[model samples]
Target: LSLNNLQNIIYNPVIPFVGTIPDQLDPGTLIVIRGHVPSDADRFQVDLQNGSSVKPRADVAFHFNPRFKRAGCIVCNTLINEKWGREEITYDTPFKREKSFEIVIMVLKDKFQVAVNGKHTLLYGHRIGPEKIDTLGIYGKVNIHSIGFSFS
Candidate 1:
């Protein structure tokens, strides 16, 4: 059960603060965000909140594979809540040329299964749940073209 409105698209390069996600994810619910992180972006932060001003969760890091500006560079990471052990899956890959990719986030009870373009890219089984996240924020720029999120 998905709708066209799940897709959020951005045509310009700007950072915006999104709102809290619905308390429950619909069965077969999936989220896919597509956009280019400004090529000049130094570092960015992706935040998840539970209707609060601050998130007290920490224990994970976004991992950039290849570690260089090249094709096939894979980016993956996990955000572990500081207190309740709640976790969320995060990732982004880079390309040498103009390219785009899709991330599918499946929120589960004990963990999150992250997939990229229909492929399984990461499996995080601990420090994740549905109660600690309501908002998602992506802020920072070294440079990027655009970015947006979707829920369906």
Candidate 2:
């Protein structure tokens, strides 16, 4: 089976990348991220935000953060207005430094189901809804090969 059947893929995007989502995400939409954690990476983040605003930062629907300090851990959260909500942290991280990882997040009506490297991971409930997530932002120390979207 193939692991890539997504549309409007962005390949080898520059780090700290920010781009408009190609489609309006709804239930059954899958966002895919194929990337590598830097050898000396501390942390990296991927966010689905309403827009790309600077002064008045847009609200983020989903925020996926992978941190590698002493050990590895995953932090998930939402951004409302311009402040962060309570973080949903998980210790069963499926990532390692200097390694490639595949992340797939499926959109649901009330939550997001995420899988890392084909392993079922975390579920983030909608705090700000996904309808207005027109922008995707990837930041911090990481290298992404491609980002894609598949709507079923």
Candidate 3:
């Protein structure tokens, strides 16, 4: 999940950021996002989308969102044909407010395996084709430090 081989890295992107993936992602590719959760942040989401359309929302292959309400939980889901599928939630909270975190999303043949702060967080099965996902969107209240992708 190292970004040593990655070329195009976005640093300090604005919130609610949406950026294009340089190329079609392959099975061994890794997308890494380094950021911090603000103390006032209630939730944040990182989505791997097929497109960046606004009128018709693009399909999201993997939607990784962490919510900090009572007991923090992570929700993972997929959107296909503009409809959301069943969600997978994990109650194990690995995120802390005002704390720095590292998220590594690994592109596999059938799913996206995610890790946070060097620990395995959860996995989201690909509902839409992984190749169809070409954009990465980070929305809500995360202070992004950098976003990097590596194809290996």
Query: In candidate 1, which residue ranges exceed 4 Å CA deviation?
Result: 1-13, 55-98, 126-128, 142-152
The digit string of per-residue lDDT tens for model 3 on 18-56 reads 999998889988898999988899999999998899768
TM-score head-to-head 1 vs 3, winner? 3
- When summed lDDT is taken over every stretch of 10 residues in candidate 1, the lowest stretch is 59-68
Please provide TM-scores, in order, for all candidate models, with all chains considered together. Answer: 0.56, 0.95, 0.94
Clashes of 2: 0
Local distance difference test values of all predictions, in order: 0.46, 0.90, 0.88
Summarize candidate 1's per-residue lDDT along 1-152 as a digit string, tens digits: 23245645544445754454554543345555454444554344444444445545433323222222433344445554544332333334433233444556665556555565566766555343555455655555423333444454
Going through the candidates in the order shown, the clash numbers are 18, 0, 0
Once model 3 is optimally superposed onto the true structure by TM-score, how far is the C-alpha of residue 76 displaced, in angstroms?
0.7
Off by over 4 Å in 2: 1-4
TM-score of 1: 0.56
RMSD of 3: 1.3
